[PDB]
Design a binder for this molecule. Structure first.
Ligand SMILES: O=C(O)[C@H]1O[C@@H](O[C@H]2[C@H](O)[C@H](O)[C@H](O[C@H]3[C@H](O)[C@H](O)[C@H](O)O[C@@H]3C(=O)O)O[C@@H]2C(=O)O)[C@@H](O)[C@@H](O)[C@@H]1O
Ligand SMILES: [Ca+2]
Ligand SMILES: [Ca+2]
Ligand SMILES: [Ca+2]
Ligand SMILES: [Ca+2]
Ligand SMILES: [Ca+2]
Ligand SMILES: [Ca+2]
Length: 480
């Protein structure tokens, strides 16, 4: 059931306030049980209501607004509006609005000629209560010149899809997904916004971010994060393809998140690290193309690190855990640090720092001069019964180029494996070389590292840093 805004008195002349006419069309479509509100090419001026939560236009269940195309149909806020306006198009607070959407139109926040925080598209039910909008679609929508958030789908929305859309020149974030669930952001561009290209926050989970592009933003290209409150972390965030480039901060930042994945993206020209991972439990960083970042200074293309929130709202320390970093092309240093559990950490052409922490890790440096750090004797060991399920292995150690950093472990040098020395040994068939502490500790464990290949004759004392002085002399990276 199609309704034309023109038939309800909308002028689309750039001067008349068409808010009531477009709302009438929306209400007629809703009362018929659903329909498409069509808008022909033209600039429609709209105004807010008594309160910020009134937005400007109130979309309703089973109503879809179809324009004549981005740039053709433009919905613009009136000159002189001076009130906070939370959603130029929005669904109602306190209602579980469903099966609605917007296509082929532009929202213009008119921040130049207005004052107050304005958001373009706002969805959701009630902050901090159970309940959700659901089945929400934005297709080929452009949102520009709002003073705060362009696309601002909010808590909670299930099965939001935003595809083939653009957010640009907004005051804060182009796209913000607040407690989005089972939702899809595909083939979008967010550029030249005041802060973030994309910001996934507030417990969002099962999100696919496929083939999105973020550039020229004042802050991150994409950030996935808990947010400032003590609430459940986001989880199951899959970022595939796209490009995150020339932003004012990190290209992609992921923090206080569980089961995040970043695969096949191009990440370049950012002012800070290309990829930064802070306190993430389950991180896959696969097959990306990462180069020419840290333009504003900084030593690393990729940073894996913890997130210490002990002085913050949660009181918790969050380790990065369960990391898989493989197949990336990285023209610069990767800092690949993780902790308890099995990590697979592959460096790239740069001079990388690798430390899988506790648990059995498999490390490779790739090209360049890499440092494999072992920070605790309990991070790589054989137990009293000879079980090797906690012995780390280094895949491609290159004597004369790479370095094993044992500077915190209190061994003196190579030797017979007793009295604080480590023994350099080959296995029976000559396929693996070991560094062994032959002295069991009180729990019966032996520090041990396995190295692929036969290195008993090529590996020497200058390939291992046994104390801080040796580390200063021999360290291969800018990261210690
Ligand atoms: O998490 C936030 O704080 C979130 O709040 C959003 O504004 C909400 C606001 O929090 C509140 O729920 C308000 O509720 C109004 C309701 O809309 C209606 O006017 C009712 O008569 O009174 C309620 C009230 O006074 O509590 O609705 C706001 C809304 O805009 O839906 C946004 O500001 C968001 O940016 C922020 O993160
Ligand atoms: Ca709603
Ligand atoms: Ca202004
Ligand atoms: Ca580990
Ligand atoms: Ca390397
Ligand atoms: Ca190397
Ligand atoms: Ca380990």
């Amino acid at each position: 059931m199609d309704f034309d805004v023109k038939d309800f008195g909308a002028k689309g002349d750039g001067k008349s306030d068409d808010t009531e006419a477009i709302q009438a069309a929306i209400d007629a479509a809703y009362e018929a049980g659903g329909g498409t509100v069509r808008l022909s090419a033209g600039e429609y001026r709209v105004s807010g209501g008594d309160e910020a939560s009134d937005g400007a236009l109130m979309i309703k269940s089973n109503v879809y607004m179809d324009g004549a195309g981005m740039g053709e149909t433009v919905i613009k806020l009136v000159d002189g509006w001076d009130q906070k306006l939370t959603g130029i198009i929005r669904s109602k607070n306190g209602e579980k609005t469903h099966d609605y959407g917007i296509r082929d139109l532009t929202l213009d926040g008119n921040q130049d000629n207005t004052e107050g925080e304005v958001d373009g598209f706002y969805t959701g039910y009630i902050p901090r209560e159970d309940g959700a909008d659901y089945n929400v679609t934005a297709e080929r929508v452009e949102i520009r010149e709002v003073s705060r958030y362009g696309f601002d789908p909010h808590e909670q929305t299930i099965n939001l899809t935003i595809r083939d859309s653009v957010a640009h020149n907004n005051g804060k974030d182009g796209f913000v997904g607040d407690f989005q669930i089972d939702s899809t952001f595909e083939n979008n561009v967010s550029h030249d916004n005041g802060r973030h290209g994309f910001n996934i926050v507030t417990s969002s989970h099962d999100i696919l971010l496929r083939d999105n592009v973020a550039y020229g933003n004042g802050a991150n290209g994409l950030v996935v994060q808990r947010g400032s409150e003590d609430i459940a972390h986001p989880y199951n965030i899959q970022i595939e393809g796209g490009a995150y480039h020339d932003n004012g901060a990190e290209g992609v930042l992921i923090k206080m998140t569980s089961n995040a994945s970043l695969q096949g993206a191009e990440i370049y020209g950012n002012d800070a690290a290309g990829v930064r991972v802070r306190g993430v439990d389950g991180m896959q960083l696969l097959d990306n193309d990462i180069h020419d970042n840290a333009q504003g200074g900084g030593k690393a293309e990729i940073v894996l690190e913890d997130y210490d929130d002990r002085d913050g709202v949660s009181g918790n320390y969050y380790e990065t855990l369960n990391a898989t970093v493989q197949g990336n092309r990285v023209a610069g240093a990767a800092q690949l640090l993780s902790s308890e559990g099995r990590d697979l950490l592959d460096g790239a052409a740069g001079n990388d720092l690798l430390d899988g922490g506790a648990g059995r890790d498999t490390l490779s440096g790739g090209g360049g001069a890499d440092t494999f750090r072992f920070a605790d004797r309990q991070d790589s060991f054989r137990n009293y019964e000879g079980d090797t399920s906690r012995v780390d292995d280094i895949v491609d150690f290159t004597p004369g180029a790479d370095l094993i950093d044992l500077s915190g472990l209190g061994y003196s040098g190579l030797g017979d494996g007793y009295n604080g020395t480590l023994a350099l040994l080959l296995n029976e068939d000559g396929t693996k070389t070991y560094l062994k502490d032959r002295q069991a500790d009180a729990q019966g464990n032996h520090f041990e590292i396995a190295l692929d290949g036969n290195l008993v004759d090529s590996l020497s004392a200058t390939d291992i840093a046994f104390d801080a002085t040796q580390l200063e002399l021999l360290g291969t990276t800018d990261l210690q």
